[PDB]
């Protein structure tokens, strides 16, 4: 009811907590900060502007600005303008996908692919409505 | 296949995060706090947990979580041990009110059976996650 909304929040928290730890090294190895790995992952799906990243993230623009250019200086992202990605940034995303796909597998080895399929389409539909509602305000 | 589910879930969460941000901006402004100060009140919406664990859960390094702690202690949305005051409780109700009616509106045409199965799958996935985490 609003149980679900709490579960979801708690679930997202848990997923972030696991991602932070699982990625502690690759981030370090790269100079990268957590909040920067995130931006690097946000750009993994679409190009942005400091403004778009700041809307989609809700944190004061300056902060997004501090990291946006720390990332350019490191040749992880690139201007075209907009915020794209370089291999070093892709390869990081590929190294991030490798770890991620590895434990995710470990704990879903016993799942039923069909039970997952219907679950997926329920969510894909909710994802659709989330994006769509966000478009306005 | 699993790389796919991972991308979607990541995207699904990036969108939920996005939405909660647009939906709660005016209110966080109306209460004079940032998004990260809002976050800090929502776990304390459940419980009360002092430092040490306060960064552990987050993943956001050294004393920033304490930086926000006194930041919020000052607006008196937080108390002392560090619990949550009557002040923050009001905020949360308002947060929950906005969140729930939207989620309700986006879910109201689904068969309770479908939603529960979703819940049950995320619930078993959250179970493995926690346990795996605990393997520190
Ligand atoms: C726009 N940048 C603001 C500025 O960050 C600084 C930022 O400085 C960073 C150091 O290089 C880094 O080694 C230093 N150490 C790291 N481990 N990253 C950062 O903590 C430091 N951050 C910062 N000064 N804000 O690099 C400078 C180029 C800067 O962007 C000046 O604008 O000062 C920050 C103070 O909060 C502002 O929030 C930022 O928005
Ligand atoms: C349990 N609290 C979680 C947290 O809630 C907080 C959340 O706070 C988060 C900021 O938005 C985010 O930009 C910021 N994101 C980063 N990538 N750094 C978070 O750091 C911040 N909270 C914090 N780090 N403790 O933003 C506020 C809108 C909030 O939803 C309360 O209303 O973030 C939410 C994101 O959807 C989670 O779902 C919630 O469960």
TrEMBL record, chain A:
Q: What is this protein called?
A: Transcriptional regulator TcaR
InterPro entries under this entry?
Answer: ArsR-like_HTH (IPR011991), HTH_MarR-typ (IPR000835), MarR/SlyA-like (IPR039422), WH-like_DNA-bd_sf (IPR036388), WH_DNA-bd_sf (IPR036390)
**Keywords for the protein's UniProt record, in alphabetical order:** DNA-binding
SUPFAM superfamilies according to UniProt: Winged helix' DNA-binding domain
Classification via Pfam families: MarR_2
Highest taxon of the lineage = Bacteria
Instruction: Name one process (GO BP) from the record.
Output: response to stress
Q: What start and end residues bound the annotated signal peptide? A: none
Per the record's keyword annotation, is DNA-binding included, yes or no? yes
Query: Residue limits of the HTH marR-type domain?
Result: 1-128
The terms under GO molecular function for this entry are: DNA binding; DNA-binding transcription factor activity
């Amino acid at each position: 009811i609003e149980d679900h909304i709490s579960f979801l929040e708690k679930f997202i928290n848990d997923v972030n907590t696991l991602t932070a730890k699982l990625l502690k090294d690759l981030q370090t190895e790269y100079g990268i900060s957590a909040e920067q790995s995130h931006v690097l992952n946000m750009l993994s799906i679409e190009a942005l502007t400091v403004g778009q990243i700041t809307e989609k993230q809700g944190v004061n623009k300056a902060a997004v600005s501090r990291r946006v250019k720390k990332l350019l200086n490191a040749e992880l992202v690139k201007l075209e303008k907009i915020i794209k990605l370089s291999n070093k940034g892709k390869k990081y995303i590929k190294e991030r996908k490798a770890i991620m796909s590895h434990i995710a597998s470990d704990m879903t080895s016993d799942f039923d692919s069909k039970e997952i399929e219907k679950v997926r389409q329920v969510l894909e539909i909710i994802d659709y409505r989330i994006q769509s509602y966000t478009s306005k305000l």
